[PDB]
Design a protein around this motif. Structure first.
Motif, PDB file in Angstrom:
ATOM      1  N   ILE A  19       0.749  -1.563  -0.110  1.00 36.19           N
ATOM      2  CA  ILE A  19      -0.280  -0.187   0.457  1.00 36.19           C
ATOM      3  C   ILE A  19       0.659   1.115   0.271  1.00 36.19           C
ATOM      4  O   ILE A  19       0.510   2.312  -0.776  1.00 36.19           O
ATOM      5  CB  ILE A  19      -0.924   0.168   1.209  1.00 36.19           C
ATOM      6  N   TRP A  20       2.442   0.805   0.053  1.00 38.82           N
ATOM      7  CA  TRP A  20       2.670   2.352   0.614  1.00 38.82           C
ATOM      8  C   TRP A  20       4.151   2.835  -0.888  1.00 38.82           C
ATOM      9  O   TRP A  20       4.717   3.374  -1.009  1.00 38.82           O
ATOM     10  CB  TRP A  20       3.461   2.611   1.242  1.00 38.82           C
ATOM     11  N   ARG A  21       2.622   2.151  -2.328  1.00 34.28           N
ATOM     12  CA  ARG A  21       3.145   2.344  -3.203  1.00 34.28           C
ATOM     13  C   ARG A  21       3.518   4.575  -2.987  1.00 34.28           C
ATOM     14  O   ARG A  21       2.296   4.948  -2.864  1.00 34.28           O
ATOM     15  CB  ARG A  21       2.925   1.667  -4.297  1.00 34.28           C
ATOM     16  N   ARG A  22       4.317   4.565  -4.400  1.00 40.36           N
ATOM     17  CA  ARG A  22       2.795   6.010  -4.762  1.00 40.36           C
ATOM     18  C   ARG A  22       2.440   6.529  -5.440  1.00 40.36           C
ATOM     19  O   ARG A  22       2.564   6.588  -6.764  1.00 40.36           O
ATOM     20  CB  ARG A  22       5.267   6.777  -5.381  1.00 40.36           C
ATOM     21  N   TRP A  23       1.476   6.537  -4.855  1.00 44.76           N
ATOM     22  CA  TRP A  23       0.056   6.286  -5.689  1.00 44.76           C
ATOM     23  C   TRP A  23      -0.348   7.931  -5.845  1.00 44.76           C
ATOM     24  O   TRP A  23      -0.318   7.613  -7.499  1.00 44.76           O
ATOM     25  CB  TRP A  23      -1.152   5.738  -4.448  1.00 44.76           C
ATOM     26  N   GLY A  24       0.099   8.736  -5.505  1.00 47.60           N
ATOM     27  CA  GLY A  24      -0.111  10.072  -5.425  1.00 47.60           C
ATOM     28  C   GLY A  24       1.168  10.519  -6.636  1.00 47.60           C
ATOM     29  O   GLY A  24       1.491   9.806  -6.036  1.00 47.60           O
ATOM     30  N   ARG A  25       0.437  11.730  -6.891  1.00 51.94           N
ATOM     31  CA  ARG A  25       1.822  13.170  -7.544  1.00 51.94           C
ATOM     32  C   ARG A  25       1.728  14.074  -6.645  1.00 51.94           C
ATOM     33  O   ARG A  25       0.802  14.914  -6.814  1.00 51.94           O
ATOM     34  CB  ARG A  25       2.303  13.257  -8.682  1.00 51.94           C
ATOM     35  N   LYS A  26       2.662  15.254  -6.329  1.00 54.01           N
ATOM     36  CA  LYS A  26       2.705  16.543  -6.131  1.00 54.01           C
ATOM     37  C   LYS A  26       3.125  16.833  -7.399  1.00 54.01           C
ATOM     38  O   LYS A  26       4.382  16.946  -8.047  1.00 54.01           O
ATOM     39  CB  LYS A  26       3.601  16.577  -5.150  1.00 54.01           C
TER      40      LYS A  26
END
Lengths: 52, 95, 204, 211, 147
Positions: free
Chosen positions: A4-11
């Motif tokens: 679950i600690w995949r980089r799901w989002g992006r800034k």
RNA sequence: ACGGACCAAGGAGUCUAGCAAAUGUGCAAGUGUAUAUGAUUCUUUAAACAUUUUACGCAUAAUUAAUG
RNA sequence: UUUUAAUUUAUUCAUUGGAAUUUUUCAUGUCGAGUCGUGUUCUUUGAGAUUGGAGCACUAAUACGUGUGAUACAUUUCACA
RNA sequence: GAUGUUAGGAGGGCAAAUCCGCCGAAUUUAAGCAUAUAAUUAAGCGGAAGAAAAGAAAAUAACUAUGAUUCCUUUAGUAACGGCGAGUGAACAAGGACCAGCUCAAACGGUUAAUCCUUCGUUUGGUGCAAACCUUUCGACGGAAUUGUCGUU
């Protein structure tokens, strides 16, 4: 195993987001681009069309 | 560093009393209980040892009493305070 | 004003009178059983200065506890490990003897009660004696009291086993504040967990 | 290691997968907190949920120039405003017993802030048209007409916010008023050099005054 | 992004680009910074010269707020203030700007750069460099110490 | 020399942290609005939008064990 | 259906206490002991002539006290609690 | 003190993700290994709640000063610890979420324990079809308590 600690989002930079929105509005303002995107606008009067 | 409670601070950031220049703004029962408890308890054995060391009344004796009190109580401050109190009681019972 | 004199007297413990009474009562406590109820506080001023009160649901138990360290629970001195962990004799317990004493009475002997505090009472070469105040959370004299009845809520069960009495606060490092404790405040384990809990934002 | 890289420093030698946590619910929690505060400000029926806090100065030389919201007005400030701490805490004024006013500037600024809040207050009767003139510094109770006419007007929530500071980082002075003889670097160096003996003098003054 | 990875282009190449002789084993040189001074010593000395050893005395607890001190050189003092007011101050010789750099966030004024000739300027700061003060009063200005 | 009797299906440089280089992009002595707040946005929306005229990081200055 | 805001209305008669502040005096009170602390031992900590805890030995002062101010001491100022 | 199948009550066991005490490794890393690391972890024992624990300074600071606890951003991979090797590693200030303060002990009250509990009765009314529930203060009795309950601060 997928975690679950995949980089799901992006800034995304706020300035870049605002640039993209402005560019999208400008692109919507030109007739050829709308036709290319796939809207059947061969019969409307003008592509930056505004209504009352 | 040290400040001054009077004489407002100098306006610089270093030195004595530096900083901004704001406007500054500014035995009737204990001893009775003490006598009662003293009468019915007395002195501890190490207090008695200090008492006789003081009664000996030499400079070496007083140094020995300070060392002994310091060892018995821990800390130079407590040792010195105990020695002064014992000297006071020795004088008060010598009168 | 009698309690002040009692406190000042007990402040000595080396006077002839205090020494004599300490000797005779520690001798009697040695013959008495390890955990035994007493009718009334033997140190009324100290018990009262702790949480004790003269209401019906308040009892006091005298507890004997063995002195010294307990030795490692390894069978003979045959710890199977690195030399850093081979010591068996100088192992000092985390809990203090006072906490162990209140546990001895609060665990199961009177599990219907709540341990409030404990105090000194006496010493000996092989035993430390303590007196533990316990409250009945089911007595109406305790329940109806606007004070003290906080202990009736079932979140104060076995404070002596959760380290919530004064002895527990002492051995948990909660009797000191600021830079001298620093990492004990929300509990040592909770602070440790918080200090390496790695937080990742969804968008980084 | 190899090549020209920074020497590795990663503190991942323990069981860190048990300690990883990722906030998928950041904006959900935002919504929940917003909903809760909206619900309680609806529940209390007109009175703001915010409480008045004093303007205090941040400690240390880093944040010397900056002010912020402290917790609790002091006893002296509450007295200057004319109200007791017990009464003040009933009308949304925070009070703390720990702070002290070392400076008249802070004292008067927080007192004037308290007075402005008191003047902005309009008090609702405890007993439904049994208005009374109040105690403990509480303002006199407003009556039916003013309560009705003020209940339908936007509350002044700007008073709770930390005050903005006027910024005169720029200003002008006449050239002839420029002191051409001052030596700032020399003054700083001399003050640093003399600090030690002046602390000695201050200690001697304290010892003398002790008698 | 996983379809741009270099391992994809070695899909049928047996060794996955890690060598047929040397292979890809698990920590063949040690873990982390293991071999410093012994077999990674050349790397350590070639890329991180002063790594080993200690120099200087300890500062037991620091409290960086005590010594926090942002700096500004004199060549940015005029640029601190807006262009129109710069023009006005340069035009009018009877008045000069006094600038409190502490409000802008600077504690010490340093002396690098060139100030405008014959343009008085007063500067308020907690600390001043010697050369900074010299230039300030050389252009006819003044340094003011504040706290 | 070792593995492979045959066929099907599964089967191995990935994920995260941190650093750098390369390149693309935005802005530029500034850059990134962190946590959080607001808003007639609330299927989507856990995303989009926004931030009453010194928060913080990195950069804008180095050097020294250090008072500096 | 739950509760919970605003909005409706309260009027006479009575004595029974309590509370805040403000006037004028008495009196500078109390404030947690085998506890703190110290030594030593073990552990724990980033805590380093010891961060906390514990065992053992010794064992306090009384608010002018005693605890903190990250290097062990002695004499002593100051601040905070 | 004992003893009571005297009257009325409580504890015991299950369940654990989060939570509170204790006890407590080694694999591992150091390219060996013993301090160190793994780790104040796993395993083991005990104890609670819808949260727990912490918490109203014997706290910071050194400033123009802040003001219980907790948590988030940061301080900061920093001060520091460490065969100063591998590795380990906080705190204050700053910005936020939330925001709450209190009481025993001690003091004072003896022309009067002004307190508390048990049991037995009386009514002041209310919602329930019912079952049952919420309010009610006049007591009487038997005790506890001056080896100290309650009021005041």
């Amino acid at each position: 195993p997928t975690k679950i600690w995949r980089r799901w989002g992006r800034k995304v930079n706020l300035k870049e987001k605002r640039y993209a929105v402005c560019s999208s509005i400008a692109a919507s303002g030109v007739t050829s681009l709308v036709l290319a995107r796939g809207h059947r606008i061969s019969h409307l009067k003008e592509v930056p069309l505004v209504v009352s | 560093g040290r400040k001054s409670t009077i004489k407002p601070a100098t306006g610089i950031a270093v030195g004595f009393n530096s900083g901004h220049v704001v406007t500054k703004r500014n035995s009737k029962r204990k001893e009775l209980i003490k006598d009662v408890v003293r009468e019915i308890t007395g002195f501890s054995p190490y207090e008695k040892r200090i008492i006789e060391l003081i009664k000996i009344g030499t400079s070496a004796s007083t140094k020995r009493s300070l060392k002994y009190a310091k060892k018995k109580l821990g800390t130079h401050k407590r040792g010195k305070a105990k020695r002064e109190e014992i000297q006071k009681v020795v004088i008060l019972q010598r009168r | 004003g009698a309690y002040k004199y009692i406190q000042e007297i007990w402040k000595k413990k080396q006077s002839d009178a205090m020494h004599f009474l300490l000797r005779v009562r520690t001798w009697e406590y040695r013959q008495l059983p390890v955990v035994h109820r007493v009718s009334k506080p033997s140190r009324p001023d100290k018990a009262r200065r702790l949480g004790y009160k003269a209401i019906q649901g308040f009892v006091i138990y005298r507890v004997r506890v063995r002195r010294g360290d307990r030795k490692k629970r390894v069978k003979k001195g045959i710890v199977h490990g690195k030399p850093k962990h081979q010591g068996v004799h100088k192992q000092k317990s985390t809990r203090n003897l006072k906490s162990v004493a209140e546990g001895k009475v609060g665990k199961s002997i009177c599990g219907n009660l709540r341990v409030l505090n404990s105090y000194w009472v006496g010493q000996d070469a092989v035993y430390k004696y303590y007196e533990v105040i316990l409250v009945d959370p089911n007595h109406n004299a305790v329940r109806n009291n606007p004070k003290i009845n906080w202990i009736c809520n079932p979140v104060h069960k076995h404070r002596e086993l959760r380290g919530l009495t004064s002895a527990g606060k002492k051995y948990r490092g909660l009797r000191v504040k600021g830079h001298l404790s620093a990492k004990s405040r929300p509990s040592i384990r909770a602070n440790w967990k918080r200090r390496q809990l790695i937080k990742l934002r969804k968008c980084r | 290691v190899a090549h020209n890289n920074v020497l590795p420093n990663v503190h991942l030698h323990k069981w860190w997968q048990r300690h990883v946590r990722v906030n998928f619910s950041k904006n959900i929690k935002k919504k929940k907190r917003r909903l809760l505060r909206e619900k309680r400000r609806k529940a209390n029926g007109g009175t703001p949920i915010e409480k008045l806090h004093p303007i205090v100065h941040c400690p240390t030389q880093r944040y010397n120039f900056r002010t912020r919201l402290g917790k609790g007005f002091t006893f002296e400030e509450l007295k200057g405003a004319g109200l007791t701490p017990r009464a003040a805490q009933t009308i949304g004024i925070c009070y703390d017993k720990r702070r002290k006013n070392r400076s008249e500037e802070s004292l008067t600024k927080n007192v004037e802030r308290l007075l402005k809040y008191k003047n902005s207050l309009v008090m609702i009767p405890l007993k439904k048209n049994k208005a009374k003139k109040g105690i403990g510094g509480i303002p006199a109770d407003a009556d039916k007409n003013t309560i009705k006419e003020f209940r339908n007007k936007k509350p002044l929530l700007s008073i709770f916010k930390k005050e903005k500071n006027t910024k005169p980082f720029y200003e002008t002075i006449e050239v002839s008023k420029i002191d051409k003889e001052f030596l700032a670097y020399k003054t700083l160096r001399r003050a640093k050099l003399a600090e030690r003996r002046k602390n000695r003098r201050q200690q001697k003054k304290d010892i003398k005054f002790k008698s | 992004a996983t379809r741009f990875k270099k391992n994809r282009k070695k899909r049928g190449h047996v060794s996955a680009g890690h060598g047929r002789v040397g292979k890809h084993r698990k920590h063949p040189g040690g873990r982390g910074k293991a071999g410093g001074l012994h077999h990674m010593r050349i790397n350590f000395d070639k890329y991180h010269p002063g790594y080993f050893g200690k120099v200087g005395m300890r500062h037991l607890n620091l409290l960086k707020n005590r010594t926090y001190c942002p700096t500004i050189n004199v060549d940015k003092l005029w640029g601190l203030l807006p262009e129109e007011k710069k023009k006005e101050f340069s035009e009018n010789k009877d008045i000069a700007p006094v600038i409190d750099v502490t409000r802008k966030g600077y504690f010490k004024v340093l002396g690098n750069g060139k100030l405008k000739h014959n343009q008085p300027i007063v500067v308020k700061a907690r600390y001043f460099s010697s050369v900074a003060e010299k230039k300030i009063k050389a252009v006819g200005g003044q340094c003011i110490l504040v706290a």
